[PDB]
Amino acid sequence: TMALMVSIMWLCTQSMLENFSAAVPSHRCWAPLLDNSTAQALSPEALLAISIPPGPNQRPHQCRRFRQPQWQLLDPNATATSWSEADTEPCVDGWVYDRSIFTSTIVAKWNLVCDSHALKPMAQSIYLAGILVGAAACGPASDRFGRRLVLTWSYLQMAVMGTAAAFAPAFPVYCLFRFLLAFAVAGVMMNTGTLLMEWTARARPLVMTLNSLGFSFGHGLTAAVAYGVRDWTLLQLVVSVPFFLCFLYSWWLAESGTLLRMPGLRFRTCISTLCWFAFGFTFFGLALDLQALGSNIFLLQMFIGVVDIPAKMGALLLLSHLGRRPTLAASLLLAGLCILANTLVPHEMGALRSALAVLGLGGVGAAFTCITIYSSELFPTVLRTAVGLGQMAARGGAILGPLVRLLGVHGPWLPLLVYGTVPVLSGLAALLLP
Numbered sequence: 315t316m317a318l319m320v321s322i323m324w325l326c327t328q329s330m331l332e333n334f335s336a337a338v339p340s341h342r343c344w345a346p347l348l349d350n351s352t353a354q355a356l357s358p359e360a361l362l363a364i365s366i367p368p369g370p371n372q373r374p375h376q377c378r379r380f381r382q383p384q385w386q387l388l389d390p391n392a393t394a395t396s397w398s399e400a401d402t403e404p405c406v407d408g409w410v411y412d413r414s415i416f417t418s419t420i421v422a423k424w425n426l427v428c429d430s431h432a433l434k435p436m437a438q439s440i441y442l443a444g445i446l447v448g449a450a451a452c453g454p455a456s457d458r459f460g461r462r463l464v465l466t467w468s469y470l471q472m473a474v475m476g477t478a479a480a481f482a483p484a485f486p487v488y489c490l491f492r493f494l495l496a497f498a499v500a501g502v503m504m505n506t507g508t509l510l511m512e513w514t515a516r517a518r519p520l521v522m523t524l525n526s527l528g529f530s531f532g533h534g535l536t537a538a539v540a541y542g543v544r545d546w547t548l549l550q551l552v553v554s555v556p557f558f559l560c561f562l563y564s565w566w567l568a569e570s571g572t573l574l575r576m577p578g579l580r581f582r583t584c585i586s587t588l589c590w591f592a593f594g595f596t597f598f599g600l601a602l603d604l605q606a607l608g609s610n611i612f613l614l615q616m617f618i619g620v621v622d623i624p625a626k627m628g629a630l631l632l633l634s635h636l637g638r639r640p641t642l643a644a645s646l647l648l649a650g651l652c653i654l655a656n657t658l659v660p661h662e663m664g665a666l667r668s669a670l671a672v673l674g675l676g677g678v679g680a681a682f683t684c685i686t687i688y689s690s691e692l693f694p695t696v697l698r699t700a701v702g703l704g705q706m707a708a709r710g711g712a713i714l715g716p717l718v719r720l721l722g723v724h725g726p727w728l729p730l731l732v733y734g735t736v737p738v739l740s741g742l743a744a745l746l747l748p
């Protein structure tokens with residue numbers, strides 16, 4: 315059990331790595347008055363103000379630059395914002411990034427900025443699509459080639475794709491490498507889950523809670539690892555290297571039907587699929603943009619893990635001491651209300667915002683535990699593949715999760731508004747379960 319726990323722990327730091335590898339630093343247009351020693355100087359902040367027009371949040375524009383240094387806005391006797399927008403350039407000479415927090419990221423290497431800001435959520439969507447494809451293809455592969463052969467193949471693919479993406483020279487090559495890595499990640503996830511549930515199980519909820527707690531420890535692991543390197547290349551390298559060593563376990567150290575959904579329990583099937591879709595949506599939408607949910611990313615991830623562990627412990631305790639429907643409804647309602655308060659609290663209260671975000675990210679994990687336990691009891695053994703269809707719909711919702719972040723252009727509250735309104739409807743639907 316410890317081996318598979320360490321495996322899923324590294325799986326967590328290989329899957330949620332997009333939080334740190336795709337983190338966006340403060341960026342702006344390349345300017346000859348600021349990035350060239352020939353004309354660099356008066357106060358530097360005044361140079362930044364007169365060389366780049368003010369953008370959103372009263373900060374310098376993330377992508378804009380004046381044609382000439384506008385001295386007309388430096389003197390206080392003249393009103394601000396008097397410049398015309400016709401004299402602006404959309405970073406015609408390149409971009410610059412603040413290396414104070416992160417020394418190198420995929421956003422700073424391939425210029426994932428305003429003109430192509432959709433690429434990072436598109437990258438997460440491609441990663442989740444690779445997850446879906448791997449989960450859909452691991453079935454026949456594991457059923458034909460064996461349960462350990464597919465494990466070894468997934469480990470080898472993970473290691474190869476990790477060491478390849480660590481040195482990706484282009485964005486499409488990196489996207490393909492991440493697609494294959496997500497394929498292998500989903501394959502090994504399904505293999506670990508089935509190997510645990512078939513061999514370790516009466517204690518099925520205990521083993522499931524242990525596996526998901528190892529996954530939660532993966533969050534603290536990825537936080538502690540990203541706090542050290544802060545370089546996406548070295549990060550990917552040191553995160554993908556242990557799989558090639560775990561591949562030594564090959565051969566144990568060298569040998570020492572959803573068609574019945576309509577005639578069956580239609581209500582249970584649709585409600586379970588809705589709850590799984592909601593879990594996937596909310597989790598893979600919130601667990602990939604922690605930079606906007608709090609003030610510090612590493613501390614946020616550490617708190618997320620150190621609250622998810624006891625939150626999951628209490629969720630298991632309440633599921634053992636009470637029915638699965640009331641605990642699931644309560645967890646879903648709590649997560650929804652927490653995310654709604656998180657998108658409703660003003661941005662200045664960063665500590666309270668981060669606390670609400672951690673509470674919601676613990677509540678969604680508790681709801682995942684409840685739906686995982688309830689999938690094995692909602693349907694008889696003849697219909698129990700219901701859990702497979704549920705997990706597939708969860709992956710499908712996790713695919714569309716990051717795509718909602720594209721709606722941030724209309725408003726920064728709308729993605730979080732959706733991520734808070736979805737669990738409310740999920741709980742209201744689960745409240746009707748028999």
Ligand SMILES: O=c1[nH]c(=O)c2[nH]c(=O)[nH]c2[nH]1
Nearest residue numbers: 525526529530597682708709
């Ligand atoms: O404990 C889990 N956390 C997840 O984020 C996740 N995603 C998935 O597909 N299965 C699981 N299991």
